[PDB]
């Protein structure tokens, strides 16, 4: 269906097809060399060049090799450098280049390619949308917003652009404004809109404004396979792991860790209190837009399975104690952190990103009244020197209505049913 052959490539269509035949039959090495031969004999042929690039792409998959893929990425660029490239081929080649650059994590590279694509095909909305995603992937939400604003100024009902514009609005705490975009975008059914991130954030935006319909969106998102359940809405999962909002120490099997935290809780407390008194800047304000009101800060010792060595200078005995416990210090999808919350705080219902961790809370300074935590349909309280354990992939909510501060220690562990193999392999979060 796409027109990939310029005047000269039609005259060599038989050689080009012979080479492509080798690739589709999976004889990648013979195909690479066939297209190399063609490139040598016709160094200006765009189709030969693209064939070389595609073989390199398949070869990188075969060998699971980033270096080979970097080669393909340059060859996709060479296609675009050549004279007289058909438009369909130019677009395919540079689109694939950008997609593979992102796969390698070369987000700035991809962004340049996507900027080139939009300059070349100024009327192609899909490419402007793809450019916005490039900006989102490097964290440049300001530029992404400008991109989707442009798309929407010309195609107001582009559903991809709507859900992404809503995502950005929601991330900027423009909660009410984001709802119609997220909802209309999802309802559009356009390609790219049936994504759990948009169900997640529409339901959450609705919860925050007191809209009764949030859970209809959670229910639909579960029906469409994005959520394990209405209550458990994490999006980076291993399917099959036991799903329970509240866990006992014995259920987790990490009984030695719980015993050490409870037997040694006062030293953990005291180092936190010392940091609060003498190094308060190690406590950093929560910054994921999870508070309705109030004050909540965290002092993080491990994140993504990596010890923060300066932070551990502030809690050296605690860090020494925890090092005996690789189920938490090597939990590359969780953290180890102190968490202080003050009266007048309400943490919004929310879900963590992954079902691969369980969250332990050790009480350190717990006022006698006013502090509680809900996970799914059950609310509990903390106790000094005692551990609670919940699955924070379930929706949870916290209130602090005491008359003094409340300090806990948070210790994430790998979900117990994850094998050593998965624990070594899952990408960090």
């Amino acid at each position: 269906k796409p027109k990939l052959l310029n005047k000269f490539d039609k005259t060599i269509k038989a050689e080009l097809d012979a080479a492509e035949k080798l690739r589709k039959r999976g004889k990648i090495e013979e195909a690479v060399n066939a297209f190399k031969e063609l490139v040598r004999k016709y160094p200006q042929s765009p189709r030969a060049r693209y064939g070389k690039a595609q073989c390199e792409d398949d070869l990188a998959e075969k060998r699971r090799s980033n270096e080979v893929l970097r080669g393909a990425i340059e060859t996709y660029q060479e296609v675009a450098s050549l004279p007289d490239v058909p438009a369909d081929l130019l677009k395919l080649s540079l689109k694939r280049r950008s997609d593979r650059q992102q796969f390698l994590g070369h987000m700035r590279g991809s962004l340049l390619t996507l900027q080139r694509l939009v300059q070349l095909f100024p009327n192609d909305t899909s490419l402007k949308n793809d450019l916005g995603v490039g900006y989102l992937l490097i964290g440049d939400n300001d530029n992404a917003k400008k991109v989707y604003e442009e798309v929407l100024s010309v195609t107001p009902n582009d559903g991809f652009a709507k859900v992404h514009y809503g995502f950005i609005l929601k991330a900027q705490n423009k909660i009410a404004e984001s709802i119609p975009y997220l909802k209309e975008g999802i309802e559009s059914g356009d390609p790219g809109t049936d994504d759990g991130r948009f169900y997640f954030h529409l339901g959450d935006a609705m919860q925050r404004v007191g809209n009764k319909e949030a859970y209809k969106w959670y229910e639909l998102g579960h029906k469409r396979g994005h959520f394990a359940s209405v209550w458990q809405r994490s999006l980076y999962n291993v399917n099959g792991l036991k799903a329970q909002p509240w866990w006992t120490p014995k259920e987790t099997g990490y009984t030695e860790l719980v015993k050490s935290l409870e037997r040694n809780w006062k030293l953990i407390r005291d180092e936190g209190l010392a940091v609060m008194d003498k190094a308060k800047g190690l406590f950093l304000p929560e910054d994921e837009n999870l508070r309705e009101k109030g004050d909540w800060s965290q002092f993080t010792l491990w994140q993504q399975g990596r010890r923060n060595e300066n932070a551990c200078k502030g809690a050296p005995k605690t860090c020494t104690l925890l090092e005996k416990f690789p189920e938490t210090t090597g939990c590359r999808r969780g953290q180890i952190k102190y968490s202080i919350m003050h009266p007048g705080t309400h943490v919004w219902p929310h879900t963590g990103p992954t079902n691969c961790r369980l969250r332990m809370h050790l009480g350190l300074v717990i006022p006698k009244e006013g502090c509680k935590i809900r996970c799914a349909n059950e609310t509990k309280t903390w106790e000094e020197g005692k551990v609670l354990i919940f699955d924070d992939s379930f929706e949870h909510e916290v209130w602090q209505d005491a008359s003094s501060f409340r300090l806990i220690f948070i210790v994430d562990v790998w979900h117990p049913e994850l094998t050593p193999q998965q624990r070594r392999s899952l990408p960090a979060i």
Binding site: Q102, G105, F167, S234, E286, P427
Partner: peptide
């Protein structure tokens, strides 16, 4: 930008090829 307690970033994992 990391997803520590929530899911507020467009993507929570890092791209590092194969």
């Amino acid at each position: 930008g990391k997803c520590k307690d929530g899911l507020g970033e467009y993507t929570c994992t890092s791209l590092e090829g194969f």
